[PDB]
Amino acid sequence: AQRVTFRRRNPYNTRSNKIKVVKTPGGILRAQHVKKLATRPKCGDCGSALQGISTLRPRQYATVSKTHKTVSRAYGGSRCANCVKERIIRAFLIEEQKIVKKVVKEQTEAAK
Amino acid sequence: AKRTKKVGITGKYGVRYGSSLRRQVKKLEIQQHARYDCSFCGKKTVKRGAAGIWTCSCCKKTVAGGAYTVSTAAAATVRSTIRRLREMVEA
């Protein structure tokens, strides 16, 4: 039934100051200051957590390699695979329909 | 079972605030806590987020509408008036 202390000088139960109680090699209970939890990166289009990317705080994303932060696809760490698929399809298709819209007016005014 | 004859969702307000006001609030609370038909996905998923904001759980679309209903009658009228004037002028 050992009781613990905040090991720093901030006494208040703030988000910055969460603790986990941990038993040490001395046998005692001690408080251990845990950092805030890391939130996953999201796709700009859908807003959903996008897999293959490591979960960290923003300054810890500068310690690690590219592959913890990117998938090998175009729009890797930024857009979901499905969003990418959708915009590929949209791109190709409405480019083709722009061609079609062009030749339509071309032959129209050529007729008149 | 049925638990209330006539107060329904307004049993949480108890005896307070008067029958006529509880009626008025019933008629709108039902409306806004209801699910509605999505015009894009065809499903019964559209639920209010806030006043005038109706979101579809599937299709993840968001629509501006009424505070307690998706479409006001006054705005459906506007939509029809507008369709008519649009297809009246070049036609």
Binding site: - | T62, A67, Y68, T81, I82
Partner: protein
């Protein structure tokens, strides 16, 4: 006497607005070249709630036509506007909902919102939940447009002025009773400190004109001239009539 509550509301100490959660000023796009020679396309990226505003806002994204940039405008959403929707802003734009035509470019009976009263106001008249402006007629000579405002007032403005087609969303909002001082407390917690209101007749005469008495009573009339000065204007300012409205508005 003492300075009264209405006089204290101009210093703006505790009576200012609470404007932190508000997303921004819901202005129309600046009137540049496109909006008066053609149209420009934008896309609605999200409809959101604005604190202290019963109408939702629409984050429309347009492109800058001069620099590779993606300037984002904050529109008041209209009833029927949705995400993924294309908005067309300009003179040569189609008469669909969400679009920002000029008033010269729409027929009579058209229903419009966020109307500029002068071109380049970027939003005025018909901005609140459920409210709309009607176009009555035109004057292509001395280019002018007659409109009907939500008040019943007929106004004449420029046909080069703009307006968003359709009705402002959030209608029916005041058809629900609040039932609760708490609900009203939270209503005004995000606008401004205007609530609760104590009655002058329940005050002391140092604090109000209506104050004092061995009975609660105004004593003198509550109809106050417009030529009255700050500290007297408590009651019914420049009341043309008073009492219960038994009939039409004689207009």
């Amino acid at each position: 006497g003492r300075v009264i509550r209405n006089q204290r509301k101009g210093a703006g100490s505790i009576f200012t607005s609470h404007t932190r959660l508000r997303q921004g000023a819901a202005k129309l796009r600046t009137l540049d070249y496109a909006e008066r020679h053609g149209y420009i396309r934008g896309i609605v990226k999200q409809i959101v709630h604005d604190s202290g505003r019963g109408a939702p806002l629409a984050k429309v994204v347009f492109r800058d036509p001069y620099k590779y940039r993606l300037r984002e405008e904050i529109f008041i959403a209209n009833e029927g506007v949705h995400t993924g929707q294309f908005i067309y802003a300009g003179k040569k734009a189609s008469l669909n909902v969400g679009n920002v035509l000029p008033l010269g470019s729409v027929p009579e009976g058209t229903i419009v919102s966020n109307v500029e009263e002068k071109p380049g106001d970027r939003g005025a008249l018909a901005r609140a939940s459920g409210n709309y402006v009607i176009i009555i007629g035109h004057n292509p000579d001395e280019n002018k447009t007659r409109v009907r405002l939500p008040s019943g007032a007929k106004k004449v403005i420029s046909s080069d002025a703009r307006g968003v087609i359709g009705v402002i969303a959030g209608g029916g909002r005041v058809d629900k009773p609040l039932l609760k001082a708490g609900r009203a407390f939270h209503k005004y917690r995000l606008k401004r400190n205007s609530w609760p209101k104590t009655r002058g007749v329940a005050m002391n005469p140092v604090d109000h004109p209506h104050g004092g008495g061995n009975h609660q009573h105004i004593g003198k009339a509550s109809t106050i001239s417009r030529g009255a000065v700050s500290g007297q204007k408590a009651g019914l300012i420049a009341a043309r009539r008073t009492g219960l409205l038994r009939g039409s508005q004689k207009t």
